Design a protein that fits this description.
It is classed as structural protein/rna/dna. Keywords: Nuclease, structural protein-RNA-DNA complex. The entry is titled "CryoEM structure of type IV-A Csf-crRNA-dsDNA ternary complex". Chains A, C, D: Csf2. The organism of A, C, D is Pseudomonas aeruginosa. This is part of a larger assembly, with three copies of chain A and one copy of chain B. Chain A is α+β, with helices and mostly antiparallel strands. Chain A is 30% helix and 23% strand. Chain A is built from nine helices and 13 strands. Chain A starts with a strand and ends in a 5-residue tail after the last helix. By secondary structure, chain B is of the alpha+beta class. The chains are: A alpha+beta, B alpha+beta. At the A-C interface, strand 7 and helix 6 of A face strand 4, strand 5, helix 1, helix 2 and strand 6 of C. Chain A binds a DNA duplex through residues 18, 22, 24-25, 36-39, 41, 106, 108-115, 139, 180-182, 225-226, 228-231.
Chain lengths: 331, 73, 323, 329
DNA sequence: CATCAAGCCTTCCTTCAGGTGTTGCTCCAGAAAGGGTGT
DNA sequence: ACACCCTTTCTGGAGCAA
């Protein structure tokens, strides 16, 4: 089953790339040493072979959300919105290992090297949730394959293929957003501002005195840590139309129905990260099932046999498969 | 040897998921419930064997026409 | 819960963008070198994708207030207007570290590399203020999600939803506003204007000769600079979002929104730059704002009323307590 | 017969390499001991000889998919999309020896070593599927050579030969993708989050105290149960680049060419070399050349009528009896 | 209804933040002996 | 009764580069 979810982020996208990146105040990424630089936390970037100029494929940077992040977003969406309410409305409860296996593929960091029986493998791949995300102590193949969230851009034209010339994007799609943390105690202004503080003016003056001592120590170092922190993070600019490729090799109809229910409940979900700055908010503007567009304003339109299958399976959903899926053979 | 020698890993694994699907569907008549990567049909074996880029030189007494015919084949 | 606080700024909005940007005496932003240049401190702006050629969408600038700035504004009006009167009214006094953890995210720049207990996580995410704003030494996630203040503009037409198109403004929304600082010794002009000056005439003469020696060869008070601002009267929008909130947390947000009328947005405090009025507040798509404040949402106001009653310092103390 | 498939990986390619490779928090691969390092599992790279920038040849890293991986991918595509529907639709069934022989070339069905006369060797090498791969207990040589999936790259030129100077990728084709596993008990944030868990807040706090005890024990030991929090890396071949793939046939029947063509017709639903949960290895076929004649279109493979008709009559006569007699006797 | 005026100077940024913690992999790549029991 | 299947059982070393 081929599912293609074209979304539109209405907030910036921030999937933080690991690394030690810096930036000048003017906006130059990774400056040579000597000039003053601030920590930059770049967004996640996929190198893509693309056609720059004419017939000259080259590796260009295109900033994305990883398929692991979107796979866990899909997993936690169908978990918080479908699977957990189905378990709550009945008497079924999960162990902490079963909850850990359902949310992160495993209960412990150490798997057991023995694989499970063919009957249990077949029944877990027939399961609506466990078939999508087959983890556990004995590693199963989950039939859900989740691609990265690619922005519909020229740099991904060898990724996107034909049919994506509408709402086209060129050029840079990222922006460095600067964030500052000020010291609260420097923003104290009067005795009315300080009355909620134990000690008041004495404690405030002690905070200024420790900041002056630490500043003198840092000046002796240059020529603990305070609360001033001016820094930067690169985000992907809002308003982009993104492609999200979801694949299912011979799924049970309830499993693709569960993916459809999760895509229905992607409303009020954040894609990558930067929670407190409301980053990752998005609007789905299209879902195509095997190339057939099945999205409307009121969620998924059509595809009814998937929804009846997943409703019947959620009615038949229990905690027994989750418990014996997470049960280690070595334990 | 035009290059330094390297080592190639190759593995033999029978598809466990496809085996379970064929075993429920009846297309695989396997009475066994549990596989074994240790030994058997589902033994996921690993084997490492050397790899060299080289130029191969040999010396022999034979008609050139037949040798070039075989080596062009 | 999805709140849309659509506001209109009375005065020019100035959130100072980082960078050594420059301006000529005309309206040329960042000129080529070799011409007379002045330091320009531009407004904070966000690139947004917008339909510019009626088929082609492109990354265009749009001057905003950052969601960090508006989040700290909401946090500070909650603290100085709701939380601190409830704390000093009941006699509760936070520690200096607890005050720093209330106004910033924590008290120290080094967070603890341990996770807190689930009982603690549940108590603070059920707490109104600490549930809205996480952080601390052990990296709590708040339930509040604060977007940037976006102007209702055709550059943001892919950013806003529906219903904003009749209000959507086109064209440029900024101004280079010029400021200057005199050396006020040059503005003295009289021998009875130096009787307040110690030394008097000889002191003013020494300041003049020091300025002349500095100009012949420390920085004086003569400054001429510029800052780009968003134009006043612009209609904005503010997307506050709530990840599974308690009704007390929503009531704390609405209590903050009721009394942001005397609060300033971003920078320009001496120029009264941050002044604004709230045109509307949509509470999950339903309008709850009027002239007197937020009407309706009564369960949220009652929940934050019973939550502000019994608000203790010890929750902030063991939120700020390191490990 | 020399079938040659030009493909483009829509998603990244991650054919995992052996060894204990490590990377810092930046892109420095295999640092010296004494600096924080993370487990990186790299793509399948092989050192190849190339003459680029000089007349002499040098060792350059070329990130490829192994010919074993492509050979078994073609075999599993053949089985899953052609052979298993054909054996199912007539009600034929496979024993474990025949299944292992057909799906893995594996000899454990008859590990004694099956003697094979030259006549049955000829009939088995003329079988549509058995003759392609062979092996099993009879240890038969297949008609099919499957080359490695070689990227169209300047490091691959001596492999590729002429005819690939245009659309030729240059520079690095890899990028390290960072993946982490989060402990989800740390993400329990409310009573509604833990209400599904048996024990609830008590079990959640027990998990937290176990995590703190394990972290304190690890910190004391560094001066054996592993937690769910992991931060690792995997180096992938970047998506969107062009690869070539050579499948040579050593004197085939037309049914065998038709079977390879039918496998390539249904191959875009398959994945090249792992990375399965991250949808890695999804690709489109840009071209198929049968002895240099470009034969692929958007609607699969046009032309090649004799091969498709021969494999149609082969599949109409495809039973499991040939598979069971190829495995056992 | 024609020119003559058809600027001049000088400002032309200042300090500071200029990251913190964690993660820092897991497992298995055997074949026979000795029991059952299912066709 | 002879075929496949499901279990145990069992001997040794140890350093490590890109």
């Amino acid at each position: 089953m081929q599912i293609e979810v074209t979304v539109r982020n209405i907030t910036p996208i921030f999937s933080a790339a690991p690394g030690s990146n810096y930036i000048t105040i003017d906006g130059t990424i990774n400056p040579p040493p000597g000039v003053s630089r601030f920590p930059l936390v770049r967004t996640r970037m996929m190198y893509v072979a693309a056609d720059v100029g004419d017939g000259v494929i080259k590796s260009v940077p295109l900033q994305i959300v990883p398929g692991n992040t979107m796979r866990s977003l899909l997993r936690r969406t169908m978990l918080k919105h479908v699977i957990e309410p189905a378990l709550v409305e009945k008497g079924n409860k999960l162990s902490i290992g079963a909850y850990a296996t359902a949310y992160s593929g495993n209960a412990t960091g150490n798997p057991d090297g023995v694989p499970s029986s063919f009957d249990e493998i077949a029944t877990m791949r027939a399961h609506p949730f466990i078939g999508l995300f087959g983890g556990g102590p004995r590693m199963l193949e989950g039939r859900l394959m989740v691609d990265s969230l690619y922005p519909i851009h020229t740099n991904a034209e060898r990724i996107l293929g034909a049919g994506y010339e509408n709402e086209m994007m060129s050029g840079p799609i990222t922006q460095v957003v600067w964030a500052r943390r000020m010291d609260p105690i420097l923003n104290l202004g009067s005795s009315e501002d300080v009355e909620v503080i134990n000690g008041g003016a004495v404690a405030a003056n002690g905070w200024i005195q420790d900041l002056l001592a630490n500043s003198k120590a840092a000046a002796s170092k240059k020529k603990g840590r305070g609360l001033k922190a001016f820094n930067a993070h690169e985000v992907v600019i809002p308003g982009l139309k993104w492609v999200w490729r979801i694949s299912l090799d011979r799924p049970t109809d309830a499993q693709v129905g569960l993916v459809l229910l999760a895509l229905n409940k992607m409303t009020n979900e954040r894609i990558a990260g930067g929670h407190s700055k409301d980053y990752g908010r998005f609007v789905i503007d299209g879902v195509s099932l095997n190339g057939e567009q099945v999205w409307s304003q009121s969620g998924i339109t059509g595809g009814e046999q998937y929804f009846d299958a997943v409703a019947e399976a959620i009615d038949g959903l229990s905690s027994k498969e989750f418990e014996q899926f997470a049960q280690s053979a070595k334990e | 040897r035009q290059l330094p020698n390297q080592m190639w890993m190759q593995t033999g694994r029978l598809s466990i998921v496809e085996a379970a699907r064929h075993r429920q569907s009846g297309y695989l008549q396997l009475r066994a419930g549990k596989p074994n990567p240790a030994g058997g049909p589902f033994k996921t074996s690993i084997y490492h064997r050397p790899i060299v880029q080289a130029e191969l030189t040999a010396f022999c007494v034979g008609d050139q026409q037949g040798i070039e015919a075989l080596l062009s084949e």
